[PDB]
Amino acid sequence: FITWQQLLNHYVFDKSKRYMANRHFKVLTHEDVLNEYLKIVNTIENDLQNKLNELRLRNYTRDRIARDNFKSLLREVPIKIKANTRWSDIYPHIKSDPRFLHMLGRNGSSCLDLFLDFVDEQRMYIFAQRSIAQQTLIDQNFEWND
């Protein structure tokens, strides 16, 4: 969508002094106009690719949060998500949830990985309550005699 002659035609038409300045300053070349235009497009494209996927600034809108909203959404769609519920049966339940559409529409794999990580954290908490319950049962001082 931008060739050098089109980019020139936009600025040739207006007779733009900042474009013309490259032909007027002795430390610049008139063909340096193309070099600057190529380099500025290449830096802008590189920065658009980095910005839309990985921001190098602060306080914007990257990924991350989508996992926190999705991990919350799985507690919202089923309370106490069962450790034997699978990623492909939780997916039709949450396919009504638009929050999931935000996560799934970026990466199908990351949804499965977040389904595994969330379910695995619940399974560890389910083990700890069971092990504490078994410990409280054995601690009972039924010191049988005779």
């Binding site: 009504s96 949830d97 638009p98 929050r99």
Partner: protein, 71 residues
Amino acid sequence: QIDNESMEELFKLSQDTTIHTCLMGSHSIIQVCTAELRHIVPTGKSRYSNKLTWVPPAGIRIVCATSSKTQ
């Protein structure tokens, strides 16, 4: 339920907080709650029926609600 000297207790939604509720036009009610709406109409005496229910954008937490008589 309110009546003269008669104050009594009774559907709708009891499992979620109610952001707003109001009467619409004649003999109609709407109850706006955080997760979803309810459109309620009177049926008989102690009964009511939701003719339609709304989500927010598609499944969020409604921040607030206001209303007019018909609006």
